[PDB]
Design a protein around this ligand. Structure first.
Ligand SMILES: COc1ccc2cc(CC(=O)O)ccc2c1
Ligand SMILES: COc1ccc2cc(CC(=O)O)ccc2c1
Ligand SMILES: COc1ccc2cc(CC(=O)O)ccc2c1
Length: 580
C-alpha cells in the first residue's frame, strides 16, 4: 500500500532517519547540515503520517518519487546544483537516473581533522545531533559509501567519544582512535566503490562473477546452490545502495544476514561469532568474515572439467551456468588466489572451450586446459615477491617513492596530487600484505591493488588525460592490474616545461606534520619524473635524497628562510644535471 511506511516500520525511526540523511547528504554534497536535517525531519514526519493511515494521499507514491520530490524543494538548487536542477524537470525513473549521474567522487571538501575539546562539548550537549553531523560529513565525502556500513562506523565513532570525553587526556585517547577509524572508512569506501564501479562500467554479470569467486573462497564448504542464493541476494543489496536505494538496501542486507546466520552450519564454522552479535555488527562481521578451513572431501575437478567427453555438450547447453560451476569449484580450493586471478583463469577456461569445441576432436584439445592456468598464476606471484622484497628493504616511504616514479612514467599527463595519492595508496598495500603469511600475500596484494587502481580509474573519469589509462579502466575488469602493469613510459611524451617555483621550498614546510612533509616531497618527486621522464629510478632516488637533506638542514638552521633562499636555487640547478 505505502512503501515509505513499510521501510519506516521495518528499519525503526533511528535507522530510517540515519539512512535518509546519508542518502540526502550523498546526492547534495555542497548544501549545509542545517538544511539536510529539515528534509530528514519532513520526510520522517510524512512516513509517520503515512504509517498511521496508509490510504492517505501521496502515501501510495514510490520512495524515488518521494525522495526525488524532496530533493527538488531544496533552497537555491539551480544556483548551487544547476547540473542537478535540470533532472527535477524529468519524471521517474529518468529523474533518479539523472540524479545518480551528477555525483562527485573528489568534491575537494576540507580534510576531516579532529578537535577533541570542541567535539566532546558538541557530543555532550546533543549526541543525536553530533552523530548526525558525522553521517552527513562522511556521506558527502564518499557519495557511494555502503549506507548501513556507515551507520555501523558511526557507532564506532560514538564508542570513541563515550570512552575519551570523560578521560584524563582528551587528545591522547581520541587522536589515534579517530585516525584508525578514518583509516577503516577509507577501506570500506574503497571496497564499496569497486562494487558500484563494477556495476557502472562492466554490469551485474561481472559483479556476480566477482562475488561467486570471493564467497566460494570464504565459504568453501557451502553447496553451489547456497553460494548462488547468497550471491543473488548480495548483488541486489549492492545494486540498490550503489543506486541510492539505501532503505531497500538496508532491509535486504538485514534479511541476507538473517539468512546466512539461520543456515550458518551448512555455510561456515567462522560465522558463529558474527551471528551472536547485534544487527549492524552481524552484517559487518559476515562481510569481513575469515575464510573457512578447506573441506577434507573437496572434489577432483580434472574429470568434470578436462577429462569428461561431453563437456562441449554441457557448455553449449548453458554457458553462464557451467562457467559459474567451474568458477565456484576452482575458487573454493584456491583461497591463495586473488579474485581477479580467479576471474582471469575462468576467462581462460571459457576461451579454451570456445576454441576446442570448434575443432574436429575437442577432448584431446581441452584435456590440458588446467595447465594453461600455470603461467597466469606465476606472473602475479613474481610481481608480489619482487614488490615485497623491495618494500621490506627500503620501507613504506621509499617503496611509495618507487611506485610514484613507476606510475608517473606510465601516466605523466595525470595530475601530481592524483599520482602521489595512488603511489601512497599502492605503498600501503606493501605495509598491509607483505607482513602476512606468504600464502595470504598474493590475494591481499591483488585485491587491494584492485581498490587502488579503481580509485585511479574513478579520478580518471572526472579528469581524463590518458587513452592508455581509459583502455586499462574500461576494457576488462579481470585484466586491469595486468593492463596497468604492462604500461611503459610513452616515447612520444613531451617533457614538462621546467618551472623553478615548482621545486621552491620555504620554512612553512618545517611546522608541517610528518606525512604532510612526505606529500610535499613526493609531489616534488612526481614533478621531477614529468620534467626528466628518461631519468633512471636510481637517479631520482639520489636527487630527492638531496631534497630531503636540504629540508632537514634548513628546518634546523638559525635563519630557516635565509637557508631555503640561498641553498634552494643551487640544489634545483644541480638537480637538473643529475637527472640527464
Ligand atoms: C604488496 O604490495 C604491492 C604493491 C604494489 C604492487 C604493484 C603491482 C603492479 C605493477 O607492477 O605496477 C604489482 C604488485 C604490487 C604489490
Ligand atoms: C560466469 O562465469 C564468469 C567467469 C568469469 C568472468 C569474468 C568477467 C570479467 C571480465 O569480463 O573482464 C566477467 C564475467 C565472468 C563470468
Ligand atoms: C626518492 O625517490 C625514490 C626513492 C626510493 C626508490 C626506490 C626504488 C627501488 C630501486 O632503487 O630499485 C626505486 C625508486 C625510488 C625512488
Amino acid at each position: 500500500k505505502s512503501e515509505i511506511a513499510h521501510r519506516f516500520n521495518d528499519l525503526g525511526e533511528k535507522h530510517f532517519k540515519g539512512l535518509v540523511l546519508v542518502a540526502f547528504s550523498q546526492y547534495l554534497q555542497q548544501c549545509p547540515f542545517e538544511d539536510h536535517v529539515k528534509l530528514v525531519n519532513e520526510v520522517t514526519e510524512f512516513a509517520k503520517k503515512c504509517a498511521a493511515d496508509e490510504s492517505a494521499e501521496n502515501c501510495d507514491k514510490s520512495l524515488h518519487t518521494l525522495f526525488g520530490d524532496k530533493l527538488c524543494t531544496v533552497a537555491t538548487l539551480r544556483a548551487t546544483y544547476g547540473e542537478l536542477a535540470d533532472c527535477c524537470e524529468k519524471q521517474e525513473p529518468e529523474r533518479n537516473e539523472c540524479f545518480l549521474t551528477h555525483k562527485d567522487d573528489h568534491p575537494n571538501l576540507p580534510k576531516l581533522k579532529p578537535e577533541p575539546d570542541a567535539q566532546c562539548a558538541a557530543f555532550q550537549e546533543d549526541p543525536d545531533k553530533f552523530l548526525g553531523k558525522y553521517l552527513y560529513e562522511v556521506a558527502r565525502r564518499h557519495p557511494y559509501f555502503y549506507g548501513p556500513e556507515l551507520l555501523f562506523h558511526a557507532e564506532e565513532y560514538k564508542a570513541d567519544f563515550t570512552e575519551c570525553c570523560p578521560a584524563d587526556d582528551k587528545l591522547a585517547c581520541l587522536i589515534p582512535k579517530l585516525d584508525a577509524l578514518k583509516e577503516r572508512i577509507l577501506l570500506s569506501s574503497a571496497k564499496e566503490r569497486l562494487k558500484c564501479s563494477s556495476f557502472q562500467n562492466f554490469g551485474e554479470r561481472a559483479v556476480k562473477a566477482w562475488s561467486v569467486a570471493r564467497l566460494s573462497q570464504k565459504f568453501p564448504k557451502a553447496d553451489f546452490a547456497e553460494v548462488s542464493k547468497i550471491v543473488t541476494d548480495l548483488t541486489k543489496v549492492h545494486k540498490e545502495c550503489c543506486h541510492g536505494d539505501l532503505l531497500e538496501c538496508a532491509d535486504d542486507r538485514a534479511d541476507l544476514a538473517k539468512y546466512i546466520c539461520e543456515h550458518q552450519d551448512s555455510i561456515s564454522g567462522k560465522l558463529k561469532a558474527c551471528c551472536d552479535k547485534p544487527l549492524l555488527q552481524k552484517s559487518h562481521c559476515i562481510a569481513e568474515v575469515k575464510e573457512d578451513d578447506l573441506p577434507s572431501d573437496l572434489p577432483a575437478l580434472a574429470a568434470d572439467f578436462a577429462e569428461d567427453k561431453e563437456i562441449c555438450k554441457h557448455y553449449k547447453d548453458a554457458k553462464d551456468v557451467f562457467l559459474g560451476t567451474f568458477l565456484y569449484e576452482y575458487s573454493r580450493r584456491h583461497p591463495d588466489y586473488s579474485v581477479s586471478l580467479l576471474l582471469r583463469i575462468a576467462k581462460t577456461y571459457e576461451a579454451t572451450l570456445e576454441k576446442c569445441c570448434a575443432e574436429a576432436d575437442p577432448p584431446a584439445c581441452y584435456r590440458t586446459v588446467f595447465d594453461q592456468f600455470t603461467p597466469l598464476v606465476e606472473e602475479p606471484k613474481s610481481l608480489v615477491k619482487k614488490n615485497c622484497d623491495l618494500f621490506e628493504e627500503v620501507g613504506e616511504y621509499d617503496f611509495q617513492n618507487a611506485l610514484i616514479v613507476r606510475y608517473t612514467k606510465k601516466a605523466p599527463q595525470v595530475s601530481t596530487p592524483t599520482l602521489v595519492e595512488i603511489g601512497r595508496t599502492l605503498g600501503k598495500v606493501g605495509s598491509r600484505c607483505c607482513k602476512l603469511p606468504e600464502s595470504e600475500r598474493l590475494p591481499c596484494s591483488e585485491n587491494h591493488l584492485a581498490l587502488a587502481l579503481n580509485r585511479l580509474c574513478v579520478l580518471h573519469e572526472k579528469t581524463p588525460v590518458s587513452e592508455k589509462i581509459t583502455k586499462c579502466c574500461t576494457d576488462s575488469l579481470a585484466e586491469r592490474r595486468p593492463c596497468f602493469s604492462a604500461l611503459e613510459l610513452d616515447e612520444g611524451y613531451v617533457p614538462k616545461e621546467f618551472k623553478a617555483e615548482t621545486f621552491t621550498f620555504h620554512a612553512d614546510i618545517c611546522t608541517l606534520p610528518e606525512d604532510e612533509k612526505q606529500i610535499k616531497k613526493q609531489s616534488a618527486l612526481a614533478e621531477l619524473v614529468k620534467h626528466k621522464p628518461k631519468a633512471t629510478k636510481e637517479q631520482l632516488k639520489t636527487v630527492l635524497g638531496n631534497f630531503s637533506a636540504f629540508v632537514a638542514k634548513c628546518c634546523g638552521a638559525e635563519d630557516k628562510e635565509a637557508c631555503f633562499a640561498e641553498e634552494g636555487p643551487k640544489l634545483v640547478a644541480s638537480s637538473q644535471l643529475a637527472l640527464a
